Structure 1
């Protein structure tokens, strides 16, 4: 949960998340990257849970890096409300993952533990993933 500090508005559009990736396909700092085969939405709590899970099993010399950040708000009006009458409140934060997007990159630690840990961390993500090797 990396909550934004200040925002110009409160209830904007969510996204048009189809089509190819606007970026994040490249791997910059890590040796193994976790790419996605399609796009969907990622809520804040899942990111924090996956990050603490991947860091707990991580050693004392490797380093990991996140390529995404929740920048979309969402409205979920309370239960039993009717359809219409304005807009609701913010309840969480959503990050947008287009097709062919890399979420995590890790380096500086043996590879087998890293592929195992990346599998165990991507199991916490809603979108099926794929391992991708370091780009020269």
Structure 2
């Protein structure tokens, strides 16, 4: 699974998912997958989506990753009232805003790209879309 080895702080505020996109256009390959819905991606979902599409694309080409967890969350143990400090360490997640690219692809024809991204789109808990790199 995916997680940074060293973190500046053991826990971070919950935060908000408000705002617009930054990586609207792909700048590394020819094809990419862009998120249309709003939600969160965990380490398992990123690992599952990458594994699912990997079996569909041959080593020929190139694969890019545009999503990192970057956000810690904790969970409260059982039989504990409100208080007693913050929650314990269970797993982390990532913040996703609709409009930025999630995965980037290059090196194999579009038909394989459609099949590969379709397989990985279902395991993502959000609706995505396919885009093609344009000039500039």
Counterpart in the other structure of 1:11 = 11
Instruction: Name the SS for the 1:59 alignment partner.
Output: coil
Structure 1 gap segments, 5+ residues each: none
1:89-121: CA deviations, max 9, x gaps? 221121111121210110110110111110111
SS, match of residue 87 in structure 1: coil
TM normalised by structure 1 equals 0.91
Aligned partner of 1:27 in structure 2 is: 26
Does residue 133 of the first structure (1) align with residue 132 of the second (2)?
Answer: yes
RMSD over aligned Cα atoms: 1.3
Identify unmatched segments of 5+ residues in structure 2. none
Match of 1:64? 63
Corresponding residue for residue 54 of structure 1: 53
TM-score by length of 2: 0.91
Correspondence list, 1:26-45, <5 A:
26-45=25-44
Distance 1:127 1:18 in 2: 16
